[PDB]
Amino acid sequence: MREYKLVVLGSGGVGKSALTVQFVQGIFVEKYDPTIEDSYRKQVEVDAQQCMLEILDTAGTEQFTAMRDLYMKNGQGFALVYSITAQSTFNDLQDLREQILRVKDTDDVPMILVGNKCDLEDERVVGKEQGQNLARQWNNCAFLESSAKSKINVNEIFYDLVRQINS
Amino acid sequence: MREYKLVVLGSGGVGKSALTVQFVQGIFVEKYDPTIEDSYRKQVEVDAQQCMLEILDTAGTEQFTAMRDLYMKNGQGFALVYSITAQSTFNDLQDLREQILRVKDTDDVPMILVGNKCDLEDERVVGKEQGQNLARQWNNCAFLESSAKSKINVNEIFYDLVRQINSG
Amino acid sequence: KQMSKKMNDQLELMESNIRRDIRQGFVDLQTEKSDLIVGAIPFLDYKHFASRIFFPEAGTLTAVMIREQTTVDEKCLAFAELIRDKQFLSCFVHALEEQKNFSIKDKCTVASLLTLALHGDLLYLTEIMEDLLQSLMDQSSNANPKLLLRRTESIVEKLLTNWMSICLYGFLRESVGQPLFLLVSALTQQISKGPVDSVTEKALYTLSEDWLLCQAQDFEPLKLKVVFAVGEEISESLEVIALTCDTIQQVKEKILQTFQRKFGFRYTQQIRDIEIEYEKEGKFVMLQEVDDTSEIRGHVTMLNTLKHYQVGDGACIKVITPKIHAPLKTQNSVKDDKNFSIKYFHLVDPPEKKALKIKEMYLIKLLSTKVAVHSFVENLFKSIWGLPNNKAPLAVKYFFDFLDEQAERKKITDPDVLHIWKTNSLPLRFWVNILKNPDFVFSDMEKSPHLDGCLSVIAQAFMDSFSLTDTHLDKHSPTNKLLYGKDIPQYKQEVKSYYKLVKDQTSISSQELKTFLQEESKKHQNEFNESAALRELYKYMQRYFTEIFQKLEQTDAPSNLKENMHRVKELFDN
Amino acid sequence: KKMNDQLELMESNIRRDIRQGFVDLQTEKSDLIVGAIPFLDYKHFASRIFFPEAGTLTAVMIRDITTVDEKCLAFAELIRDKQFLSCFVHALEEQKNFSIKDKCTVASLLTLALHGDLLYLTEIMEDLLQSLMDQSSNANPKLLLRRTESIVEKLLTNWMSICLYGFLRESVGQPLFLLVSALTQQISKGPVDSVTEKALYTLSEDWLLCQAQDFEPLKLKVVFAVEISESLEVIALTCDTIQQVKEKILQTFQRKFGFRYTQQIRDIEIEYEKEGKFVMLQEVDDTSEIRGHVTMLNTLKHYQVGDGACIKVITPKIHAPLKTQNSVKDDKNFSIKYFHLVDKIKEMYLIKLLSTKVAVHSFVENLFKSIWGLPNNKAPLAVKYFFDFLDEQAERKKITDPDVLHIWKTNSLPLRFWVNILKNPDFVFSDMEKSPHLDGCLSVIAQAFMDSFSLTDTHLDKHSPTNKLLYGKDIPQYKQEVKSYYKLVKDQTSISSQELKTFLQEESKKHQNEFNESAALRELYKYMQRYFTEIFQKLEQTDAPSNLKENMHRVKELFD
Ligand SMILES: Nc1nc2c(ncn2[C@@H]2O[C@H](COP(=O)(O)OP(=O)(O)O)[C@@H](O)[C@H]2O)c(=O)[nH]1
Ligand SMILES: Nc1nc2c(ncn2[C@@H]2O[C@H](COP(=O)(O)OP(=O)(O)O)[C@@H](O)[C@H]2O)c(=O)[nH]1
Ligand SMILES: [Mg+2]
Ligand SMILES: [Mg+2]
């Protein structure tokens, strides 16, 4: 097994905790609790090779002034998340990428763009092609529309982060 | 490393706890705490062979209605103790050894008779020859006058018990 | 170089295993809820209680002491009138102890027989215990005051336990009984949450390291729907929780525990009568404790559990008795075998797993259980050394004033001696005895050696609160002190404050003693019989006659007493 | 055949370590900790809250050291109108270029500008927040105030600070400082790696030293130069680095004397008594354990420092003309160059996370019970008023779910404000150099804190975060208090405007000479000239009188 520090980033209430719990505890519950700091971990296998994951579910980008720098330096894999219910969550993913590439000081940072909550096709304000365009904009990065309420693309996120850390 | 179960029997305040602590921590503190049930254990090299000992520190004979027969049943070695300042405690060991032999249903049981507080010769009541004759009377039983305060024959007790368990 | 691979892999799997283990230990310790707990406490009537305390030797024979004929046995009248003498009974108590043929059992015997004889007149019993205790003190040969009452070298001590019991019964049934039964029940319930080894009674949840089941074992709480038969097909549902590792008998005991806990009546007197059936293909097949499909390690067979039968959650399970269809569905109770502990095994029998037997890796369970039942422990403790209505029990106050006045009678300028006497007389010689023998106070209480161990632990914890020395617990100290090492000082403070409060409470003239002791005496004069007591004390009077006669002659004895002695002899003879 | 001995020693050390964890957890005696609490003046408080980015520069918004500036009064006059300001904030919010930081910027600038007139600020914040609330087309009422997509939120944080500061110095500050000091002290009680700052004792698995370091507490007799001598006693560990020992001596000095021994640590040297003569010990000398490209720092144990050893101290003006060592901690690449404790099981030390969690628990309870406590059976004024606003608005949007009320209250008050204060103690207290570790621990405590507000009964399992398990047993008691705390404010008396206007006016007047509106409005204007077409296109749609446009263009005529 191998240690894999990952970080989940996004605006307030974009389904970070949701995806995380859905990935580790398997179950999802429509509950309203703001995350502050939650270091998870889980034994999981990728590419026929078992390793030890270490998830960090982060907080809202501005619910409070926080340790925004520490986990960017120490983190290795990054999953940026927006919600397809509010547009601003998509408008707030740029500065994230910026601070990541700045603090880490390199263009080769294992990252994945995720438009979560893809189970709402009536409240959709952010197109999938939009997120794909932002994905290609970031030096051809990965883009996976997911949903913690339907187990869609959930595992693929962390598996892709690990794979990108590999190569 | 095999596990040995040595049980320390006796009356009230003969130095069972004193001897056990002195054997375990090497410290003697003149205090007054009635033992109810204390379970000690320590790794010690016996006869150039590192074995794992487990000393059970029981209470006085009749301080409360107690579970005498359990640790007798499971116990592999026994160190009966008496204070040489009180003849009564020396008298009280007979029915105890009797219960040991009755429960074990044998006669070749690893056992040692210890007359603690042999550092108080000015206050001695029980002669050494008394306990010695009593040990002889108990089928060539092992006997030692000990002093947990003055560190006299403290380890040789449990040692000889271990050497007796592995004997025939 | 080929061995390096196997070594590395081994250490790896082992490491990750230890990870899963310790992790599960922490997670468990943090996620342990308190779903413990009753109503009417199965108290014993004072006759049965007192009889169990005075004679816990021959438990069943003690019914011989529970109650015309008195007027017939004039010998008993003479002996009784003789016991009421202070000098005589003094010589009678000392001369016996003076002889080396007089053992500990003899001392307990004498103390209790004398208590039963003198159970009609408890006034005199109090006063004679006072002189017997002061003589064990003032004129004591081997007297190191801070070591008094510890060695059982006298009759007076066991007598003191008896008297404490007599006088404090009321206080037990009133203020201490409930939390004690609540704690016994708490522990019992708590240990039944986790696996227990059917052959060693070692369990996962426990307060004793000796009793700890430091064995690797995967278990899971199974909810079982229980059906009762009453013919072939009769069913009524019941919910019973067991474990995957529970042996058949253990399961039976659980469904019976539950049944009694729902209907207040045992479904069966003997547990052997019940057999348990299982549904796999819609049909019920009786499961037996050991079958032809049971592995054997050397020469010992392994007990069949529920995981052995592949029992899943929500499984239906039938209960049969001996009058239903046991004409053919009768099994032989394995536990009945004499050498059952040598012919069978459950969860114990004497490379990764070789290092998975590490005892310390389970010590956290001792903590967990210690955490589980700590509320009841504190409740009991506080209710022992607490004072309802700001006053203390009559016997406690009175007796502590007695000790104080005794220290005054011997010129002692060390409060540590008073403290020591207080803690050697009451909690050691009484409270520990109720703590370690809850069956004395309750009925239908089957005490196990395991529960004995847990109660041992809590008792010792209780005793350290009466210590005077701040003990430095290190790596060398026994776990039973470690577990309660943090709660000790608070208890210590409460103890010193308790002795203070008792000391400062208003004193008690012998008028209150009069009305009280007369009330108890009149309450219990007819309950026991002084006849069997005195008749069983005569055996002791004539067995050491010359020594008592001598001890009485050395203390200026009247002609009356001795003439009464020889009269007693002549009456018992002729 | 060489695995039996290796595993012998292995399992031996394992047993010893687990047993030692149990022993330490059982033998943990409380000996933590103050006097006066160094709070921050309201100015630096407000400024370091409004702009946490520009650290020192915030003091430029403090006029504690305007008629000539003809552009300020005009723009302020513009802001004074509700329509203009509403359309301003709204139009600015509707922009894709408008980054996240820009919202905090404009919010802080706006609050700083209108800090003199709290009545207008309160009113316009009510209106704007209700706009965010009832007219939000892309928002769920239970996710309100969660996603930072409005100025009104940061502005709400600011206002919270403004109105609750008095309560902070009243009953929440002291326990907070006590918890922080107790935390630092506790962590520092057990070994800390100089390179990773991972200590044995903590409240975070991430910040955990996962190595069995056999150390031993030592009472060191410290001497001071002035030659000259002065005795002292410092409790240091055998695994401590030279600079760690130094830090402990300095701490002991500054605590037992009330004034610090120095301002710089780099200018002090430590001498040890060998056999009469005093040898000055350095961070790394010749015989140092070097393993490849990394070298081991000198510990006390490296010089065989016995218990009760003698220690001398050297200042840069005493004898440090030639007796001075170089500071390794300043090295631009120190991590890569040197190592201390690290260069193998983690969960074996989860027990440590319990130990500390107990040592620092009473203080946690004090802080929590204070935060939702009622002084003289009365809740804070701002709390009651704002919650009255939430109640009235919830009654004004056709909602029949008390959950929405609770959720709004838990997304507005403790999340926006109390976490900002809990995780950021230096926004409250002066001279508190913030360490990352303590930030992690505070994140754990703040996390538990807000878990005490959850309406969802979530059973903790094996796949739960260690931080959740660490406070999970204590949570459900707090929940019931939080639930009951909320309802008391509901049952609190309605706030009379007579008390309101006075409460606002007193602080407004008591803070009119604190902040300068000049720099504020001057920085605020820059967003207007950036997105002018938007502001105008919205304002003209919101029926703007010729007054607003004339005034606006006059302002643009005065600014350019
Ligand atoms: N329909 C749907 N709802 C979701 C999904 N993920 C999260 N949610 C809801 O969004 C709300 C807030 O998400 P949460 O993960 O708690 O926010 P975070 O902790 O800040 O990342 C929760 O109440 C969830 O019920 C999803 O994939 N589908
Ligand atoms: N002189 C002397 N005193 C002892 C010795 N052992 C025990 N004592 C004293 O006996 C008292 C009670 O001993 P303790 O260990 O509590 O007896 P226990 O009931 O067998 O545990 C203590 O206060 C000791 O001072 C010894 O070897 N020599
Ligand atoms: Mg979250
Ligand atoms: Mg003892």
Residue numbers in the entry:
A (entry chain H): 1 to 167
B (entry chain E): 1 to 168
C (entry chain A): 554 to 590, 593 to 622, 629 to 791, 794 to 913, 923 to 1146
D (entry chain D): 558 to 590, 593 to 624, 631 to 791, 796 to 912, 929 to 1145
The article reads:
Plexins are a large group of type I transmembrane proteins that serve as the major receptors for semaphorins. Instead it is active specifically to the Ras homolog Rap, and this RapGAP activity is critical for plexin signaling. Semaphorin binding to the plexin extracellular region induces formation of the active dimer of the cytoplasmic region, which triggers its GAP activity to inactivate Rap through the non-canonical catalytic mechanism for signal transduction.
To stabilize the interaction, we covalently linked plexinscyto and Rap1B in vitro by using a protein ligation system based on the transpeptidase activity of sortase from Staphylococcus aureus (see details in ‘Materials and methods’). We therefore used the γ-phosphate analog aluminum fluoride (AlFx, x = 3 or 4) to induce formation of the transition state complex between Rap(GDP) and plexin. We crystallized this complex with AlFx and determined the structure to 3.3 Å resolution. The four PlexinC1 molecules form two pairs of dimers, consistent with the dimerization observed in solution. Residues 60–63 in Switch II form a tight hairpin-like turn, which brings Gln63 close to AlF3 (therefore named the Gln63-in conformation).
